[PDB]
Amino acid sequence: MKKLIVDLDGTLTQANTSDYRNVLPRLDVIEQLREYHQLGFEIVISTARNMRTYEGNVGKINIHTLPIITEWLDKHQVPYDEILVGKPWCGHDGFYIDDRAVRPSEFASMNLEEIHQLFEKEK
Amino acid sequence: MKKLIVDLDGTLTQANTSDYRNVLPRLDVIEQLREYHQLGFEIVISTARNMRTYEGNVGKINIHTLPIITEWLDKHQVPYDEILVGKPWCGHDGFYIDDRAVRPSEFASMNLEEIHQLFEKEKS
Amino acid sequence: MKKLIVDLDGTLTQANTSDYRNVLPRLDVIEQLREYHQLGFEIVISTARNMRTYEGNVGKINIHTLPIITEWLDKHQVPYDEILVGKPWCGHDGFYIDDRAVRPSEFASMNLEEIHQLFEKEK
Amino acid sequence: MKKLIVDLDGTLTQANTSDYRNVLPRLDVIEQLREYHQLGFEIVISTARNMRTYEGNVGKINIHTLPIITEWLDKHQVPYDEILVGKPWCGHDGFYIDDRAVRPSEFASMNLEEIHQLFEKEK
Ligand SMILES: [Hg+2]
Ligand SMILES: [Hg+2]
Ligand SMILES: [Hg+2]
Ligand SMILES: [Hg+2]
């Protein structure tokens, strides 16, 4: 069992507009997801989207946010096995620290061998 | 409002042993957490620990896992404002993809300006 | 701030069929919900639907369960401010124990004073 | 598989003081939990405790709330297999509506048979 846990905004999107319905896709990143799906990886979209607007209220995110996510994922033929909302929002200046984390430009640029290598170096 | 969201196993720990009580600290990473706390950043420990063992049951994780995490964090003087369990487990071969993610070796060796640069280069 | 936390199956529905899209509404209970909404109560639909099927995987409930919940709620004109999925599944013989809990027939048949009296007895 | 989903304050406790560490147990309710535990019922303590104080922030509840819940459950010899926090807070006048819900003094006074009877009247 192997999953990719994939952020939505800025990772699968170009984050060019506040209108989530019409945000531009990052095509190279999405195409890489497809190749990983072919390799047996499950794809989990995990996102903090609208955690700021609703002050962490998942009950509201489930109503106003989820529909537009799925609609957008479908329109751009992004493969996904799961969607998860309510991810902790780091804030404007915040960020995530993780030994198994890659940035979307590294994911698009590297094969599995050399992603494995990035991680082994940490260990 | 600014937060670091920090993984536990492999980021704050050297992952040298299955005994979580007695696992060795990554001292350079923790020391960097202290400097960021000084800058006004809130520290959130977020972990998938025991998601495999309990098959996703946070009801059990709350009982068996949380006490040992806090005890360990306290023992090693790790600053934290929040703990969050129930992070999605990626499996042995899985990983996270995120435009705001840094690995613990990058976090330990770069300043804020430098981290900011990694991210800005992602936007074009 | 005052909230009704409302179960879905067997409370807002008659639980007459496993086909959630076409399941019959409990009209009296829904209408009482309309009154409480007018009185300033936030309405939170909380449900364990498809927890059994997906074995607690909300990643999948978000994809396959949520759309049908909202479509149904919308067509039967149920007031709601929040939907919450991922509620613990009690199993067939299991149940819920809460000092502030009413069953749908009690809610349908009593007024606010009466319900408060039901709880004041508990104290 | 069969589960009791049990609320904490006012159900397992007498809710006589805001000092959770020294709050009185409802001995009859706890003793009934033990009998259900003997019959093969899993016991899930589920609670909104400290959701008001921390404004829904589970990251804080895990730190300041869980240890005290656990020490108290252990002290009063309460059987449990799971603790769930972060349950939605109904507010002062709010309440829960569920077709499988019993109040803690219905649980205390009835046996399994009549509790099932209590539910088949709703069905
Ligand atoms: Hg951020
Ligand atoms: Hg992994
Ligand atoms: Hg049940
Ligand atoms: Hg309440």
Coordinates of C-alpha atoms and ligand atoms in Angstrom, one line a residue:
Chain A
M1 CA 0.0 0.0 0.0
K2 CA 1.4 3.3 -1.2
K3 CA -0.2 6.7 -1.4
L4 CA 0.7 10.2 -2.7
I5 CA -0.7 12.9 -0.4
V6 CA -1.1 15.9 -2.7
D7 CA -1.8 19.5 -1.8
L8 CA -4.3 21.3 -4.0
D9 CA -3.6 25.1 -4.4
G10 CA -0.2 26.0 -5.7
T11 CA 0.6 22.3 -6.3
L12 CA -2.0 21.2 -8.8
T13 CA -3.1 24.8 -9.6
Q14 CA -1.1 27.8 -10.7
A15 CA -2.9 29.9 -8.1
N16 CA -3.5 32.8 -10.6
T17 CA -7.0 33.7 -9.4
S18 CA -9.1 33.7 -6.3
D19 CA -11.9 32.1 -8.3
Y20 CA -11.2 28.4 -7.5
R21 CA -13.6 27.2 -10.3
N22 CA -11.4 28.9 -12.9
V23 CA -7.9 28.5 -11.5
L24 CA -5.3 27.3 -14.1
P25 CA -3.9 23.7 -13.8
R26 CA -0.2 22.9 -13.4
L27 CA -0.2 20.4 -16.3
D28 CA 3.2 19.0 -15.8
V29 CA 2.4 18.1 -12.2
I30 CA -0.9 16.5 -13.0
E31 CA 0.6 14.4 -15.8
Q32 CA 3.2 13.1 -13.3
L33 CA 0.3 12.0 -11.0
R34 CA -1.1 10.0 -13.9
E35 CA 2.3 8.1 -14.3
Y36 CA 2.3 7.4 -10.6
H37 CA -1.3 6.1 -10.7
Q38 CA 0.0 3.7 -13.4
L39 CA 2.6 2.6 -10.9
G40 CA 0.0 1.5 -8.4
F41 CA 0.0 4.7 -6.1
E42 CA -3.2 5.8 -4.7
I43 CA -3.8 9.6 -5.0
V44 CA -5.1 11.5 -1.9
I45 CA -5.9 15.2 -2.5
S46 CA -5.5 16.9 1.0
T47 CA -6.2 20.6 1.3
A48 CA -6.5 23.5 3.7
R49 CA -8.7 25.4 1.2
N50 CA -11.3 27.6 2.9
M51 CA -9.9 26.9 6.4
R52 CA -9.1 30.6 6.6
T53 CA -12.5 31.8 5.3
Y54 CA -14.5 29.5 7.6
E55 CA -12.2 29.7 10.6
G56 CA -11.6 25.9 10.6
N57 CA -15.3 25.0 10.3
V58 CA -15.3 21.8 8.3
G59 CA -19.1 21.8 8.5
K60 CA -19.0 24.8 6.1
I61 CA -16.1 23.6 4.0
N62 CA -18.0 20.4 3.3
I63 CA -20.9 22.5 1.8
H64 CA -19.2 25.4 0.0
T65 CA -15.7 24.0 -0.9
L66 CA -15.9 20.3 -1.7
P67 CA -18.2 20.6 -4.7
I68 CA -15.9 23.1 -6.5
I69 CA -12.8 21.0 -5.7
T70 CA -14.3 17.8 -7.3
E71 CA -15.8 19.7 -10.3
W72 CA -12.3 21.2 -11.0
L73 CA -10.5 17.9 -10.5
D74 CA -12.9 16.2 -12.9
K75 CA -12.7 19.0 -15.6
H76 CA -8.9 18.7 -15.7
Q77 CA -8.8 14.9 -15.6
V78 CA -6.8 14.8 -12.3
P79 CA -6.9 11.2 -11.0
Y80 CA -7.8 10.9 -7.3
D81 CA -8.8 8.1 -5.0
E82 CA -9.5 10.3 -2.0
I83 CA -10.2 13.9 -1.1
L84 CA -9.5 15.2 2.4
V85 CA -10.3 18.7 3.6
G86 CA -9.7 20.4 7.0
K87 CA -5.9 20.4 6.6
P88 CA -4.2 22.7 9.2
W89 CA -3.7 26.1 7.5
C90 CA -0.1 27.3 8.0
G91 CA -0.9 31.0 7.4
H92 CA 0.7 33.5 4.8
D93 CA 4.2 33.1 6.1
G94 CA 3.9 29.5 7.4
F95 CA 5.1 26.1 6.1
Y96 CA 5.2 22.4 6.5
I97 CA 8.3 20.4 7.6
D98 CA 8.4 16.6 6.8
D99 CA 11.1 14.1 5.9
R100 CA 8.9 12.6 3.1
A101 CA 8.0 16.0 1.6
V102 CA 8.6 17.0 -2.0
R103 CA 7.8 20.3 -3.8
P104 CA 5.7 20.1 -7.0
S105 CA 8.7 21.2 -9.1
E106 CA 10.8 18.4 -7.7
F107 CA 8.0 15.9 -8.2
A108 CA 7.5 16.9 -11.9
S109 CA 11.2 16.9 -12.5
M110 CA 12.4 13.6 -10.9
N111 CA 11.7 9.9 -11.3
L112 CA 11.0 7.6 -8.4
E113 CA 14.6 6.5 -8.1
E114 CA 15.7 10.1 -7.4
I115 CA 12.8 10.9 -5.2
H116 CA 13.8 7.9 -3.1
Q117 CA 17.4 9.3 -3.1
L118 CA 16.2 12.7 -1.7
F119 CA 14.6 10.8 1.2
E120 CA 17.5 8.3 1.9
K121 CA 19.8 11.3 2.2
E122 CA 17.7 12.6 5.1
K123 CA 17.8 9.3 6.9
Chain B
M1 CA -0.7 34.5 12.2
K2 CA 2.1 32.1 11.2
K3 CA 2.5 28.4 11.9
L4 CA 5.1 25.7 11.4
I5 CA 3.4 22.4 10.7
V6 CA 6.0 19.8 11.9
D7 CA 6.0 16.1 11.3
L8 CA 7.3 14.0 14.3
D9 CA 8.9 10.7 13.3
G10 CA 12.0 11.3 11.1
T11 CA 11.7 15.1 11.5
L12 CA 12.1 15.6 15.2
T13 CA 13.4 12.0 15.7
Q14 CA 16.2 10.0 14.2
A15 CA 13.8 7.0 13.9
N16 CA 16.5 4.7 15.3
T17 CA 14.1 2.5 17.3
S18 CA 10.5 1.2 17.4
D19 CA 10.3 2.2 21.1
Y20 CA 8.9 5.7 20.8
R21 CA 9.6 6.5 24.5
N22 CA 13.3 6.1 23.9
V23 CA 13.8 7.4 20.4
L24 CA 16.8 9.8 19.8
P25 CA 16.2 13.5 19.1
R26 CA 17.3 15.4 16.0
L27 CA 18.9 18.2 18.0
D28 CA 19.7 20.6 15.1
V29 CA 16.0 20.4 13.9
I30 CA 14.6 21.0 17.4
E31 CA 17.0 23.9 18.0
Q32 CA 15.8 25.5 14.8
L33 CA 12.2 25.2 16.1
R34 CA 13.3 27.2 19.1
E35 CA 14.6 30.0 16.9
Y36 CA 11.4 30.2 14.9
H37 CA 9.3 30.2 18.1
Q38 CA 11.4 33.3 19.0
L39 CA 10.4 34.9 15.7
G40 CA 6.7 34.5 16.7
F41 CA 5.9 31.3 14.8
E42 CA 3.4 28.9 16.4
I43 CA 4.6 25.2 16.4
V44 CA 2.1 22.5 15.4
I45 CA 3.2 18.9 15.8
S46 CA 1.2 16.8 13.2
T47 CA 1.8 13.1 13.0
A48 CA 0.5 9.9 11.4
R49 CA 2.1 7.8 14.3
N50 CA 0.1 4.6 15.0
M51 CA -2.3 5.2 12.1
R52 CA -0.9 1.9 10.7
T53 CA -1.1 0.0 14.0
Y54 CA -4.6 1.1 14.8
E55 CA -5.9 1.1 11.2
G56 CA -6.9 4.7 11.3
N57 CA -8.6 4.6 14.7
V58 CA -7.9 7.9 16.4
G59 CA -10.0 6.7 19.3
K60 CA -7.2 4.3 20.1
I61 CA -4.4 6.8 19.1
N62 CA -5.8 9.3 21.6
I63 CA -5.3 6.6 24.4
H64 CA -2.1 4.8 23.5
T65 CA -0.1 7.3 21.3
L66 CA -0.7 10.8 22.6
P67 CA 0.6 10.4 26.1
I68 CA 4.0 9.1 24.8
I69 CA 4.3 11.9 22.3
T70 CA 3.8 14.6 24.9
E71 CA 6.1 13.0 27.4
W72 CA 8.8 12.7 24.7
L73 CA 8.3 16.3 23.6
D74 CA 8.6 17.5 27.2
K75 CA 11.6 15.4 27.9
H76 CA 13.5 16.9 25.0
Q77 CA 12.4 20.5 25.5
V78 CA 10.6 20.6 22.1
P79 CA 8.4 23.8 22.0
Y80 CA 4.9 23.2 20.7
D81 CA 1.6 25.0 20.8
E82 CA -0.6 22.3 19.3
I83 CA -0.5 18.5 18.8
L84 CA -2.5 16.9 16.0
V85 CA -2.8 13.2 15.4
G86 CA -4.6 11.3 12.6
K87 CA -2.5 12.6 9.8
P88 CA -3.0 10.5 6.6
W89 CA -0.4 7.7 6.5
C90 CA 1.4 7.4 3.1
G91 CA 2.7 3.8 3.5
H92 CA 6.3 2.7 3.2
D93 CA 6.8 4.0 -0.4
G94 CA 4.5 7.0 -0.3
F95 CA 5.2 10.7 0.2
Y96 CA 3.7 14.2 0.5
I97 CA 3.6 16.8 -2.3
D98 CA 3.3 20.5 -1.3
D99 CA 4.5 23.9 -2.6
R100 CA 5.2 25.0 1.0
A101 CA 7.0 21.9 2.1
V102 CA 10.6 21.7 3.3
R103 CA 12.6 18.6 4.4
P104 CA 14.1 18.7 7.9
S105 CA 17.7 19.0 6.5
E106 CA 16.7 22.0 4.5
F107 CA 14.9 23.6 7.5
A108 CA 18.0 23.0 9.7
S109 CA 20.5 24.5 7.3
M110 CA 18.7 27.5 5.7
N111 CA 17.5 30.9 7.1
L112 CA 14.0 32.3 6.7
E113 CA 15.0 34.4 3.6
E114 CA 16.4 31.2 2.1
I115 CA 13.3 29.2 2.8
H116 CA 11.2 32.0 1.3
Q117 CA 13.3 31.8 -1.8
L118 CA 12.6 28.0 -2.3
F119 CA 8.9 28.8 -2.3
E120 CA 9.1 31.9 -4.5
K121 CA 11.0 30.0 -7.2
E122 CA 8.1 27.5 -7.1
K123 CA 5.7 30.2 -8.4
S124 CA 7.4 30.6 -11.8
Chain C
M1 CA -25.0 30.7 20.0
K2 CA -27.3 27.6 19.9
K3 CA -27.1 24.5 17.7
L4 CA -29.2 21.5 16.9
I5 CA -27.0 18.6 16.1
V6 CA -29.2 16.4 13.8
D7 CA -28.6 12.8 12.6
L8 CA -29.7 12.1 9.1
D9 CA -30.8 8.5 8.5
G10 CA -33.9 7.5 10.6
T11 CA -34.2 11.1 11.9
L12 CA -34.6 13.2 8.7
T13 CA -35.3 10.1 6.6
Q14 CA -37.7 7.2 7.0
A15 CA -34.8 4.7 6.4
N16 CA -37.2 2.7 4.1
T17 CA -34.6 2.0 1.4
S18 CA -30.8 1.6 1.0
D19 CA -31.1 4.0 -2.0
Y20 CA -30.2 7.3 -0.2
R21 CA -31.1 9.3 -3.3
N22 CA -34.7 8.3 -3.2
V23 CA -35.3 7.7 0.6
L24 CA -38.5 9.1 2.0
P25 CA -38.5 12.3 4.1
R26 CA -39.7 12.5 7.7
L27 CA -41.7 15.6 7.0
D28 CA -42.9 16.4 10.6
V29 CA -39.3 16.4 11.9
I30 CA -38.1 18.5 9.0
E31 CA -40.8 21.1 9.6
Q32 CA -39.9 21.3 13.3
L33 CA -36.3 22.0 12.1
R34 CA -37.7 24.9 10.1
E35 CA -39.3 26.4 13.3
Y36 CA -36.1 26.0 15.3
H37 CA -34.2 27.7 12.4
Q38 CA -36.6 30.7 12.8
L39 CA -35.9 30.8 16.5
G40 CA -32.2 31.4 15.8
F41 CA -30.9 27.8 16.0
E42 CA -28.0 26.8 13.7
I43 CA -28.7 23.4 12.1
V44 CA -25.8 20.9 11.9
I45 CA -26.4 17.6 10.0
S46 CA -24.1 15.0 11.6
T47 CA -23.9 11.5 10.1
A48 CA -22.2 8.2 10.1
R49 CA -23.5 7.4 6.6
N50 CA -21.1 5.1 4.6
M51 CA -18.8 4.8 7.6
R52 CA -19.5 1.0 7.4
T53 CA -19.0 0.7 3.6
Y54 CA -15.7 2.6 3.5
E55 CA -14.5 1.4 6.9
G56 CA -14.1 4.8 8.4
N57 CA -12.4 6.3 5.3
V58 CA -13.8 9.9 5.1
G59 CA -11.5 10.4 2.0
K60 CA -14.0 8.2 0.2
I61 CA -17.1 9.5 2.0
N62 CA -16.2 13.0 0.7
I63 CA -16.3 11.6 -2.8
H64 CA -19.2 9.2 -2.9
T65 CA -21.4 10.2 0.0
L66 CA -21.5 14.0 0.4
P67 CA -23.0 15.0 -2.9
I68 CA -26.0 12.7 -2.5
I69 CA -26.5 14.0 1.0
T70 CA -26.7 17.7 -0.1
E71 CA -28.7 17.0 -3.2
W72 CA -31.3 15.2 -1.0
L73 CA -31.3 17.9 1.7
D74 CA -31.8 20.6 -1.0
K75 CA -34.7 18.9 -2.8
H76 CA -36.6 18.3 0.5
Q77 CA -35.7 21.9 1.5
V78 CA -34.0 21.1 4.7
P79 CA -32.4 24.1 6.5
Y80 CA -28.8 23.5 7.4
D81 CA -25.8 25.6 8.1
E82 CA -23.3 22.7 8.4
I83 CA -22.8 19.1 7.3
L84 CA -20.5 16.9 9.3
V85 CA -19.6 13.4 8.1
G86 CA -17.4 10.8 9.7
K87 CA -19.5 10.3 12.8
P88 CA -18.7 7.0 14.7
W89 CA -20.8 4.1 13.6
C90 CA -22.5 2.4 16.5
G91 CA -23.1 -0.9 14.6
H92 CA -26.5 -2.7 14.4
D93 CA -27.1 -3.1 18.1
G94 CA -25.1 -0.1 19.2
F95 CA -26.5 3.3 20.5
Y96 CA -25.8 6.7 21.8
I97 CA -25.9 8.0 25.4
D98 CA -26.1 11.8 25.9
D99 CA -27.8 13.9 28.7
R100 CA -28.9 16.4 25.9
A101 CA -30.3 13.8 23.5
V102 CA -33.8 13.6 22.0
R103 CA -35.2 11.0 19.6
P104 CA -37.0 12.2 16.5
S105 CA -40.5 11.5 17.8
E106 CA -39.8 13.5 21.0
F107 CA -38.5 16.4 18.9
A108 CA -41.5 16.2 16.5
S109 CA -44.1 16.1 19.3
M110 CA -42.8 18.4 22.1
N111 CA -42.1 22.2 22.2
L112 CA -39.0 24.0 23.6
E113 CA -40.2 24.3 27.2
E114 CA -41.0 20.6 27.2
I115 CA -37.6 19.6 25.8
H116 CA -35.8 21.8 28.4
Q117 CA -38.0 20.1 31.1
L118 CA -36.8 16.7 29.7
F119 CA -33.2 17.8 30.3
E120 CA -33.8 19.7 33.6
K121 CA -35.0 16.3 35.0
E122 CA -31.6 14.9 34.2
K123 CA -29.6 17.4 36.3
Chain D
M1 CA -19.6 -5.3 16.2
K2 CA -21.6 -3.2 18.6
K3 CA -20.6 0.1 20.2
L4 CA -21.9 2.4 22.9
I5 CA -21.1 6.0 22.1
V6 CA -21.1 7.7 25.5
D7 CA -20.9 11.4 26.3
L8 CA -18.8 12.4 29.3
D9 CA -20.0 15.5 31.2
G10 CA -23.5 15.1 32.7
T11 CA -23.6 11.5 31.6
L12 CA -20.6 9.8 33.3
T13 CA -20.2 12.8 35.6
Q14 CA -22.6 14.7 37.8
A15 CA -21.4 18.0 36.3
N16 CA -21.3 19.6 39.7
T17 CA -18.1 21.6 39.3
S18 CA -16.1 23.1 36.4
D19 CA -13.1 21.4 38.0
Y20 CA -13.0 18.3 35.7
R21 CA -10.3 16.6 37.8
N22 CA -12.6 16.4 40.9
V23 CA -16.1 16.2 39.3
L24 CA -18.3 13.5 40.9
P25 CA -19.0 10.2 39.0
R26 CA -22.5 9.0 38.2
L27 CA -21.9 5.6 39.7
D28 CA -25.1 3.9 38.4
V29 CA -24.4 4.9 34.8
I30 CA -20.7 3.7 35.1
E31 CA -21.8 0.4 36.6
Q32 CA -24.3 -0.1 33.7
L33 CA -21.4 0.6 31.3
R34 CA -19.5 -2.4 32.9
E35 CA -22.4 -4.8 32.3
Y36 CA -22.6 -3.7 28.7
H37 CA -18.8 -4.2 28.4
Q38 CA -19.4 -7.8 29.7
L39 CA -21.9 -8.4 26.9
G40 CA -19.3 -7.5 24.2
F41 CA -20.1 -3.8 23.7
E42 CA -17.2 -1.7 22.8
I43 CA -17.2 1.6 24.7
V44 CA -16.4 4.9 23.0
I45 CA -16.2 8.0 25.2
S46 CA -17.1 11.0 22.9
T47 CA -17.0 14.5 24.1
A48 CA -17.2 18.2 23.2
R49 CA -15.2 19.1 26.4
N50 CA -13.2 22.3 26.0
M51 CA -14.5 22.9 22.5
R52 CA -15.9 26.2 23.8
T53 CA -12.7 27.3 25.6
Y54 CA -10.4 26.6 22.6
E55 CA -12.9 27.6 19.9
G56 CA -12.9 24.2 18.2
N57 CA -9.0 23.9 18.2
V58 CA -8.3 20.2 18.7
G59 CA -4.6 20.8 18.7
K60 CA -5.1 22.4 22.1
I61 CA -7.7 19.9 23.4
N62 CA -5.2 17.1 22.8
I63 CA -2.8 19.0 25.1
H64 CA -4.8 20.4 27.9
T65 CA -8.0 18.2 27.9
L66 CA -7.2 14.6 27.1
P67 CA -4.8 13.8 30.0
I68 CA -7.4 15.0 32.6
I69 CA -10.2 12.9 30.9
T70 CA -8.0 9.8 31.0
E71 CA -6.8 10.2 34.6
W72 CA -10.4 10.6 35.7
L73 CA -11.8 7.7 33.7
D74 CA -9.0 5.5 35.1
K75 CA -9.6 6.7 38.6
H76 CA -13.3 5.8 38.6
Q77 CA -12.6 2.4 37.0
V78 CA -14.5 3.2 33.8
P79 CA -14.3 0.7 31.0
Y80 CA -13.4 2.3 27.6
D81 CA -11.9 1.2 24.3
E82 CA -11.8 4.6 22.6
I83 CA -11.7 8.3 23.5
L84 CA -12.9 10.8 20.8
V85 CA -12.6 14.5 21.4
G86 CA -13.5 17.5 19.1
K87 CA -17.2 16.6 19.1
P88 CA -19.5 19.5 18.0
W89 CA -20.6 21.7 20.8
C90 CA -24.4 22.3 20.9
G91 CA -24.1 25.5 23.0
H92 CA -26.1 26.4 26.1
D93 CA -29.6 25.8 24.8
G94 CA -28.6 23.4 21.9
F95 CA -29.2 19.7 21.8
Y96 CA -28.7 16.4 19.9
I97 CA -31.4 14.7 17.8
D98 CA -30.8 11.0 17.0
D99 CA -33.0 8.0 16.5
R100 CA -30.6 5.7 18.5
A101 CA -30.2 8.1 21.5
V102 CA -30.8 7.5 25.1
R103 CA -30.4 9.8 28.1
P104 CA -28.1 8.6 30.8
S105 CA -31.1 7.8 33.2
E106 CA -32.9 5.8 30.7
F107 CA -29.7 3.8 30.2
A108 CA -29.4 3.5 34.0
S109 CA -32.9 2.3 34.6
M110 CA -33.7 0.1 31.6
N111 CA -32.3 -3.2 30.4
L112 CA -31.2 -4.0 26.8
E113 CA -34.6 -5.5 25.8
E114 CA -36.6 -2.3 26.7
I115 CA -34.0 0.0 25.2
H116 CA -34.4 -1.9 21.9
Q117 CA -38.2 -1.5 22.4
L118 CA -37.6 2.2 22.9
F119 CA -36.0 2.2 19.4
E120 CA -38.4 0.0 17.6
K121 CA -41.1 2.6 18.5
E122 CA -39.1 5.1 16.4
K123 CA -38.6 2.8 13.5
Ligands
HG1 HG 1.2 28.8 3.9
HG2 HG 5.6 7.1 3.9
HG3 HG -26.5 1.6 15.4
HG4 HG -25.6 21.9 25.2

